[PDB]
């Protein structure tokens, strides 16, 4: 199962999605936001 060598890098917080890194955790989490659907469902109107 895709048991290949695609993901080298020992970091505390890395956005595997793109390949970035953030000292803090929140930074990475908030960033991952762009790596997922963000349709205007809540009280937001785009
Ligand atoms: Zn990213």
Q: Judge whether 30 lies within some domain.
A: yes
Task: Quickly list H helices, the chain.
Answer: 25-32
Terminal alpha carbon distance of the chain: 39
Q: How far is CA 10 from CA 7, 13, 34, 36, 41, in A?
A: 9, 9, 23, 24, 36
Say which CATH number the domain at 38 has. Answer: 3.30.160.60
The answer to whether the CB of 25 falls within 8 A of the CB of 40 is no
Q: Judge whether 1 lies within some domain.
A: no
Q: Judge whether 36 lies within some domain.
A: yes
Rounded CA-CA distance 2/36 in Å is: 22
Q: Judge whether 3 lies within some domain.
A: no
How was this entry determined?
NMR
Q: Judge whether 18 lies within some domain.
A: yes
Q: Judge whether 6 lies within some domain.
A: no
Q: Please give the torsion angle defined by the CA atoms of residues 15, 20, 22 and 26, in that order, rounded to the nearest 10 degrees.
A: -40
Q: 37 C-alpha to center of ligand 1: Å?
A: 13
Q: 21 C-alpha to center of ligand 1: Å?
A: 8
Q: Judge whether 4 lies within some domain.
A: no
Residue range(s) defining the domain that contains residue 26: 11-46
Q: 32 C-alpha to center of ligand 1: Å?
A: 5
The answer to whether the CB of 20 falls within 8 A of the CB of 31 is yes
How many folded domains does the chain comprise? 1
Q: 7 C-alpha to center of ligand 1: Å?
A: 14
The answer to whether the CB of 26 falls within 8 A of the CB of 32 is no
Q: 40 C-alpha to center of ligand 1: Å?
A: 20
Gapped junctions in the chain, after residues (C–N > 2.5 Å): none
């Amino acid at each position: 199962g895709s048991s290949g060598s695609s993901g080298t890098g020992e970091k505390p917080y890395k956005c595997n999605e793109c390949g970035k890194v953030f000292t803090q955790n929140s930074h990475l989490a908030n960033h991952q936001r762009i790596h997922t659907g963000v349709k205007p469902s809540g009280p937001s109107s785009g």
